[PDB]
């Protein structure tokens, strides 16, 4: 399945990062600020391959030593992974505590040690705090790797004890060329997907590979039906899913582009769908458009943040409040200081 799919835009950075470890002066803790699915996992995996290799050469693992074989097999006494438990999107303090207690003993293979957390943004406060000191002063030859959507989203204490590497996304033309090579579809839709993925080619490619593109097309059609009539409730049929935050973000981008079109911005995030954005711009006043956009993004943040929240109630209430906002003579929310 999904594995170390190396990406070209990681080449300038990887060769740099291994250098920081080749001289032996590298930081034990490297927090990667990379967009999801952009390639942070593959880069961290390759770095760990270099680190745990007993007889490495240049900028790649030998693939012959027993450390390389064990790493390939997925089992290694000196390669700990911290990933959310199956069916739960969080990293418990118990796993971090077990890993930290295991770090006390020496490395079995006589080499170094690697502790890789799949996503530091999913750390529970207790787990991140249990990892604080382990991050600060690890034992001899211990290496930590962290990945995050946003470093500032992490705990203000954990992020302090870590060298932060930022993976710059490729320029839009390079990304669209890469995805055109990977996917044979229209340029407009490809650019729209890249802008939707905040310029990250990996996320746009994953969006096209999955059914998310069909869902986006269905949501665009539902919006086209609902904008002139105000039948926003039907949007529920397209909005309620296990990937609801992504579709809410798509709606937010559409509202972004409607406000841009009213202001006349040269480029828009949704370039593949001009009819819907034009309909939104002409039908809805900017004053109510801003309120709808703010409420949609607030609902998205609430849905992402608090675990166990019910998607049905939140999405239905968002749609009903949007329909209420559409009616004239209704006060609008104002951002709170």
């Amino acid at each position: 399945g999904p594995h170390m799919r190396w990406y070209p835009w990681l080449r300038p950075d990887f060769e740099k990062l291994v250098a920081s470890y080749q001289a032996g002066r590298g930081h034990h803790a490297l927090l990667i600020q990379a967009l999801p699915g952009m390639g942070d996992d593959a880069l961290i995996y390759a770095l760990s391959r270099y680190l745990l290799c007993q007889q490495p050469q240049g900028h790649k693992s030998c693939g012959h030593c027993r450390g390389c074989q064990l790493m390939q097999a997925g089992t290694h006494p000196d390669y700990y992974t911290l990933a959310p438990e199956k069916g739960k999107n969080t990293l418990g303090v118990d796993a971090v505590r077990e890993v930290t207690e295991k770090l006390n003993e020496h490395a079995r293979l006589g080499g170094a040690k690697v502790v890789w957390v799949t996503d530091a943004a999913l750390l529970t406060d207790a787990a991140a705090n249990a990892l604080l000191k382990t991050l600060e002063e690890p034992p001899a030859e211990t290496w930590f790797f962290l990945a995050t959507r946003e470093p500032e989203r992490l705990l203000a204490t954990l992020r302090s004890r870590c060298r932060l590497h930022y993976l710059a996304p490729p320029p839009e033309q390079y990304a669209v060329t890469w995805l055109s090579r990977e996917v044979t579809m229209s340029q407009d839709a490809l650019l729209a997907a890249l802008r939707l993925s905040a310029g990250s080619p990996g996320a746009a490619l994953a969006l096209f590979q999955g059914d998310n593109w069909q869902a986006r097309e269905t949501l665009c059609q539902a919006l086209a039906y609902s904008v002139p009539s105000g039948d926003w409730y039907s949007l529920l049929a397209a909005l309620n899913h296990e990937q609801a935050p992504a579709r809410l973000h798509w709606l937010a981008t559409l509202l972004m582009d409607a406000l841009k079109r009213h202001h006349g911005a040269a480029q828009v995030t949704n370039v593949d769908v001009p009819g819907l954005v034009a309909e939104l711009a002409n039908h809805l006043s900017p004053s109510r458009l801003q309120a709808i956009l703010g409420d949609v993004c607030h609902i998205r943040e609430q849905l992402m943040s608090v675990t166990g929240i019910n998607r049905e109630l939140l999405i239905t209430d968002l749609l009903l409040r949007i329909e209420h906002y559409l009616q004239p003579g209704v006060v609008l929310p104002v951002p709170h200081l």
Partner: protein, 343 residues
Amino acid sequence: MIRLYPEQLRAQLNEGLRAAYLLLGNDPLLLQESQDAVRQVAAAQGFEEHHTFSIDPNTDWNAIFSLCQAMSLFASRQTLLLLLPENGPNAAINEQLLTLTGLLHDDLLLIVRGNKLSKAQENAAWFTALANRSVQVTCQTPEQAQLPRWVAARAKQLNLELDDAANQVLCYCYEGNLLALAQALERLSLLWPDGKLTLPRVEQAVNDAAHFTPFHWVDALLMGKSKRALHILQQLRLEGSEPVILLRTLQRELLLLVNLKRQSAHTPLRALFDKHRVWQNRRGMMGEALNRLSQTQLRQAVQLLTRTELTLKQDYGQSVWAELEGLSLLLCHKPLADVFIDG
């Protein structure tokens, strides 16, 4: 399989004991009464030695099978009793019951006590093997409407005079708690052996030890009975039920009401109810609600519901119990202030 109610058991027991008796219901009182009657009749007909067992992954089944296959030195007639788990007979338990039915003998009388049987549970072959010759007793708690008739019938059986007021008080104070209702009937009969019970006599020795379910609260909201809904809500809070259960139970119905009110502008409720598998009593209650609720009231109800959900889930606050009274007073007939619905 003769399916009966506890009213008709006596005659059946006088007709002759059956190989197996399945006491199935959600009501402890009727189950216990049927079990006591069965055991009394069996003791009258020679069944002297009584054995009781609890079904459990910790049950020493081999002992049960040996007892069913071993004769006793005294009182060869034996009665076997089992207590079904809250989940009913599991697949392994179904096989165990099939093996027990295989060893069923004329001299052995079997009694089963537990919750209701779900369709899959009696689908298992052992149920039919028993049903070839057995009796099943449905001890289901009477609903709100059927309670006064049952209370009056038991009062006439117990030889005490109840008026309408005392019956209403007993129904209002003991709903879903028929065990406590019979305890109260015994208490009132023993307190005043005159046999005449009225409002002043019964208003003293009756407490509000009712047992409710979230469905009762939702149906009270649907029918528009605000006082009954508040009573159910307070009783459920005192019981300690999780408020998220109430939130989900109300949310399902409220979303259905919102969808049907949206669709009522094009299609009558008669077809709309048949579209989404709404039952007859539910059809009547839902039609009454949809006729007595507008769009604005439903929208405000959903707004208050999502505010309560956000308070419960991300703030871990303890104001959900007080806030649910907001929905209770908003749905029935009374619009509520804006600040209490959004903020």
